[PDB]
Design an enzyme around this catalytic site. Structure first.
Site, PDB file in Angstrom:
ATOM      1  N   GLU A  71      33.034  38.677  31.745  1.00 47.78           N
ATOM      2  CA  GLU A  71      34.180  37.826  31.419  1.00 47.78           C
ATOM      3  C   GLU A  71      33.961  36.423  30.839  1.00 47.78           C
ATOM      4  O   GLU A  71      34.743  36.028  29.951  1.00 47.78           O
ATOM      5  CB  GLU A  71      35.152  37.739  32.607  1.00 47.78           C
ATOM      6  CG  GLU A  71      34.807  36.851  33.778  1.00 47.78           C
ATOM      7  CD  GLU A  71      35.971  36.686  34.757  1.00 47.78           C
ATOM      8  OE1 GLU A  71      36.873  35.853  34.517  1.00 47.78           O
ATOM      9  OE2 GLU A  71      36.026  37.428  35.754  1.00 47.78           O
ATOM     10  N   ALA A 127      41.256  42.588  32.753  1.00 50.23           N
ATOM     11  CA  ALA A 127      41.908  42.946  34.002  1.00 50.23           C
ATOM     12  C   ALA A 127      41.515  42.020  35.141  1.00 50.23           C
ATOM     13  O   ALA A 127      40.564  42.288  35.874  1.00 50.23           O
ATOM     14  CB  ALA A 127      41.588  44.402  34.361  1.00 50.23           C
ATOM     15  N   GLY A 173      47.266  30.595  41.486  1.00 50.93           N
ATOM     16  CA  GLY A 173      47.529  31.197  42.783  1.00 50.93           C
ATOM     17  C   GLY A 173      48.144  30.183  43.743  1.00 50.93           C
ATOM     18  O   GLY A 173      48.993  30.521  44.559  1.00 50.93           O
ATOM     19  N   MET A 174      47.700  28.936  43.647  1.00 48.62           N
ATOM     20  CA  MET A 174      48.228  27.862  44.490  1.00 48.62           C
ATOM     21  C   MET A 174      49.658  27.531  44.065  1.00 48.62           C
ATOM     22  O   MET A 174      50.535  27.309  44.902  1.00 48.62           O
ATOM     23  CB  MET A 174      47.342  26.618  44.360  1.00 48.62           C
ATOM     24  CG  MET A 174      47.842  25.391  45.133  1.00 48.62           C
ATOM     25  SD  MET A 174      46.559  24.130  45.199  1.00 48.62           S
ATOM     26  CE  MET A 174      47.435  22.867  46.142  1.00 48.62           C
ATOM     27  N   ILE A 175      49.895  27.502  42.759  1.00 52.48           N
ATOM     28  CA  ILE A 175      51.227  27.209  42.259  1.00 52.48           C
ATOM     29  C   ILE A 175      52.179  28.218  42.868  1.00 52.48           C
ATOM     30  O   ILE A 175      53.222  27.848  43.386  1.00 52.48           O
ATOM     31  CB  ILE A 175      51.278  27.297  40.725  1.00 52.48           C
ATOM     32  CG1 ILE A 175      50.551  26.093  40.127  1.00 52.48           C
ATOM     33  CG2 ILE A 175      52.742  27.373  40.250  1.00 52.48           C
ATOM     34  CD1 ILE A 175      50.295  26.187  38.639  1.00 52.48           C
ATOM     35  N   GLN A 176      51.797  29.496  42.827  1.00 48.97           N
ATOM     36  CA  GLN A 176      52.625  30.563  43.377  1.00 48.97           C
ATOM     37  C   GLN A 176      52.682  30.506  44.897  1.00 48.97           C
ATOM     38  O   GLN A 176      53.757  30.589  45.491  1.00 48.97           O
ATOM     39  CB  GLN A 176      52.077  31.939  42.976  1.00 48.97           C
ATOM     40  CG  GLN A 176      52.048  32.236  41.486  1.00 48.97           C
ATOM     41  CD  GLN A 176      51.793  33.703  41.225  1.00 48.97           C
ATOM     42  OE1 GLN A 176      52.711  34.524  41.280  1.00 48.97           O
ATOM     43  NE2 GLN A 176      50.534  34.049  40.972  1.00 48.97           N
ATOM     44  N   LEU A 231      46.753  39.121  36.856  1.00 51.73           N
ATOM     45  CA  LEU A 231      47.368  39.673  35.646  1.00 51.73           C
ATOM     46  C   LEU A 231      46.397  40.479  34.784  1.00 51.73           C
ATOM     47  O   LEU A 231      45.196  40.212  34.744  1.00 51.73           O
ATOM     48  CB  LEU A 231      47.950  38.564  34.762  1.00 51.73           C
ATOM     49  CG  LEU A 231      49.005  37.594  35.300  1.00 51.73           C
ATOM     50  CD1 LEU A 231      49.509  36.748  34.144  1.00 51.73           C
ATOM     51  CD2 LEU A 231      50.159  38.355  35.939  1.00 51.73           C
TER      52      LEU A 231
HETATM   53  N1  LIG Z   1      54.339  37.329  34.975  1.00 53.63           N
HETATM   54  C1  LIG Z   1      53.576  36.592  35.691  1.00 53.63           C
HETATM   55  N2  LIG Z   1      53.488  36.880  37.019  1.00 53.63           N
HETATM   56  C2  LIG Z   1      52.724  36.202  37.942  1.00 53.63           C
HETATM   57  N3  LIG Z   1      51.966  35.170  37.628  1.00 53.63           N
HETATM   58  C3  LIG Z   1      52.007  34.824  36.309  1.00 53.63           C
HETATM   59  C4  LIG Z   1      52.738  35.453  35.322  1.00 53.63           C
HETATM   60  N4  LIG Z   1      52.510  34.812  34.135  1.00 53.63           N
HETATM   61  C5  LIG Z   1      51.663  33.841  34.429  1.00 53.63           C
HETATM   62  N5  LIG Z   1      51.321  33.788  35.714  1.00 53.63           N
HETATM   63  C6  LIG Z   1      50.419  32.806  36.380  1.00 53.63           C
HETATM   64  O1  LIG Z   1      49.140  32.983  35.960  1.00 53.63           O
HETATM   65  C7  LIG Z   1      48.237  33.047  37.079  1.00 53.63           C
HETATM   66  C8  LIG Z   1      47.179  34.097  36.734  1.00 53.63           C
HETATM   67  O2  LIG Z   1      46.368  33.561  35.666  1.00 53.63           O
HETATM   68  P1  LIG Z   1      45.291  34.536  34.978  1.00 53.63           P
HETATM   69  O3  LIG Z   1      44.538  33.710  33.881  1.00 53.63           O
HETATM   70  O4  LIG Z   1      45.944  35.776  34.453  1.00 53.63           O
HETATM   71  O5  LIG Z   1      44.254  34.900  36.152  1.00 53.63           O
HETATM   72  P2  LIG Z   1      43.578  36.309  36.574  1.00 53.63           P
HETATM   73  O6  LIG Z   1      42.927  36.854  35.432  1.00 53.63           O
HETATM   74  O7  LIG Z   1      44.638  37.254  37.111  1.00 53.63           O
HETATM   75  N6  LIG Z   1      42.501  35.952  37.812  1.00 53.63           N
HETATM   76  P3  LIG Z   1      40.848  36.042  37.890  1.00 53.63           P
HETATM   77  O8  LIG Z   1      40.462  37.489  37.926  1.00 53.63           O
HETATM   78  O9  LIG Z   1      40.427  35.302  39.130  1.00 53.63           O
HETATM   79  O10 LIG Z   1      40.155  35.502  36.616  1.00 53.63           O
HETATM   80  C9  LIG Z   1      49.113  33.445  38.236  1.00 53.63           C
HETATM   81  O11 LIG Z   1      48.527  33.034  39.475  1.00 53.63           O
HETATM   82  C10 LIG Z   1      50.394  32.792  37.865  1.00 53.63           C
HETATM   83  O12 LIG Z   1      50.400  31.425  38.354  1.00 53.63           O
HETATM   84 MG   LIG Z   2      41.066  35.916  34.684  1.00 55.30          MG
END
Ligand SMILES: Nc1ncnc2c1ncn2[C@@H]1O[C@H](COP(=O)(O)OP(=O)(O)NP(=O)(O)O)[C@@H](O)[C@H]1O
Ligand SMILES: [Mg+2]
Ligand SMILES: Nc1ncnc2c1ncn2[C@@H]1O[C@H](COP(=O)(O)OP(=O)(O)NP(=O)(O)O)[C@@H](O)[C@H]1O
Ligand SMILES: [Mg+2]
EC number: 2.7.1.33
Lengths: 260, 258
Positions: A70, A7, A122-125, A11
């Site tokens: 993690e 979590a 996050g930057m891409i978004q 995502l």
């Molecule tokens: N359905 C989706 N919606 C939004 N972003 C997505 C999606 N699929 C992929 N991404 C991208 O994946 C990134 C999140 O990557 P992710 O490896 O899941 O990080 P995280 O686990 O949420 N963050 P952290 O807790 O800091 O480790 C987002 O910032 C988007 O660029």
């Molecule tokens: Mg993560």
């Protein structure tokens, strides 16, 4: 069944395992309560959690949960996926390109965090939204795929392989006549994120004397370009890149594997 | 007089050394012909060049000039600018933030390039334009000085507190649109400064040095960028060093590699 969940801040990655068959599922962290309800309406043998939001899920469910740190979960999950996909590496750097980017060196037995940087999904978004007004992730990424970066990025080719970018966005002031289309701008965003990540990665790879670089994280989801940018740049800067299918689920899978 | 010139891809940095008094001057590389016109109509005791456009100047002036390698020229000039300004360091990483960014490790004797990244002044101008339609440099950088990055960047505090967990990562959570040209430009400067620092910090660890010096015309008319790198360098565990006129390191160095 057994459930492994990562979590994160953006995502929530879920791996369901049963009868030697694992199902992958991804949900947004904003819908974490929905994941909670889903869990409670399910009969689960073991629940393993990780990620910054593991606690939020744990304190709202009705079964105990094994929570894991993690980085070690990711490392274990990644190792499992690598072997299942034919890769047998003695050591490597793995870059988890999530909301931000975390860099880790795996010596063949354990991992340690050797770096992090604010350039990632996050930057891409975020920057992507500022340059195109697109909020939907799929729409954003789909659009970026066909973009052309030549009028935006200044490369060696224009002025070390000629394929190297001398300055990202450094060509813009030379093409004010051009049509900086949403597609082109987004491609450049993905380009700089990919290049920065790769540059950090190959730097630590050199430092920890490994030429292997494994890439994971959800940022590669629905983004062929990002993967191409990193693989190519990694080769250019002289290391061997490895993309992992469902590598974004390394944490969830690792958590499940670590259950005692 | 003695003249040292660092003719880069974007800016031509000119240093004039009188008896023992030096003046500084910057011109746009697009106006290199004017610099040559200028030089010819001058009485110069010695002319030393460096930078990718040194050759263009050399074959068009009316006097013989000496051309030096930019990495070594910058190192030499920087080392002089430090000793002068009181900095005596056993070693260091210096980051030249120009059009792009180059990373070097000075071991106490000589420099060695250990890194390079596309994030720098070129990005600031280019991405800055895409986010504010501002072409004039002074205008672009001024506008960014007073911006707030809080609604744009995701910080560790939002989740070492002031560390950035994700540049531009807060944008989707603040779609209310307080994304003024100033806040956006400040965020552009923040990510460039942070990426440079992160890289510097990492190679500093790799080459075992706590010192990091920052030079480059990118810092010109942009106090925010300098502040960003200096503060972030502290957070990452190293000591920053900024040199006045450091962007003239190469020009100065070329005159002293005699
Ligand atoms: N359905 C989706 N919606 C939004 N972003 C997505 C999606 N699929 C992929 N991404 C991208 O994946 C990134 C999140 O990557 P992710 O490896 O899941 O990080 P995280 O686990 O949420 N963050 P952290 O807790 O800091 O480790 C987002 O910032 C988007 O660029
Ligand atoms: Mg993560
Ligand atoms: N008057 C100005 N006009 C344009 N850019 C300026 C000016 N003053 C400062 N800058 C900034 O300085 C950057 C150029 O830095 P600089 O160190 O001069 O690089 P350079 O020498 O031209 N590049 P390189 O050929 O790769 O060595 C620009 O991209 C701007 O961000
Ligand atoms: Mg230069």
């Amino acid at each position: 069944m057994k459930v492994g969940i990562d979590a994160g801040g953006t995502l929530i990655k879920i791996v369901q395992e049963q009868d030697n068959q694992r199902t992958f599922k991804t949900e947004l962290t904003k819908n974490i309560d929905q994941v909670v309800e889903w869990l409670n309406q399910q009969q689960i043998e073991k629940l393993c959690l990780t990620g910054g939001n593991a606690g939020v899920i744990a304190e709202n469910i009705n079964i105990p949960a094994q929570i894991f740190v993690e980085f070690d979960a990711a490392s274990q999950g990644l190792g499992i996926l690598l072997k299942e996909q034919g890769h047998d590496l003695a050591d490597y750097i793995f870059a988890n390109v999530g909301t931000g980017t975390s860099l880790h060196y795996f010596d063949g037995q354990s991992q340690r965090r050797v770096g992090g940087i604010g350039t990632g999904g996050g930057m891409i978004q975020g920057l992507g939204y500022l340059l195109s007004q697109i909020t939907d992730y799929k729409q954003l990424t789909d659009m970026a795929q066909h973009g052309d970066r030549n009028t935006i990025d200044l490369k060696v080719r224009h002025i070390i392989p000629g394929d190297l970018t001398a300055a990202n966005f450094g060509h813009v002031l030379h093409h004010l006549d051009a049509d900086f289309t949403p597609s082109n701008k987004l491609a450049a965003v993905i380009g700089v994120v990919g290049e920065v990540v790769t540059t950090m990665a190959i730097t630590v790879a050199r430092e920890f004397k490994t030429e292997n670089i494994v890439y994971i994280g959800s940022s590669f989801h629905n983004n062929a370009l990002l993967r191409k940018v990193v693989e190519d740049y990694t080769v250019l800067r002289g290391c061997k890149p490895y993309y992992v299918e469902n590598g974004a689920f390394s944490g969830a899978i690792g958590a499940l594997y670590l259950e005692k």
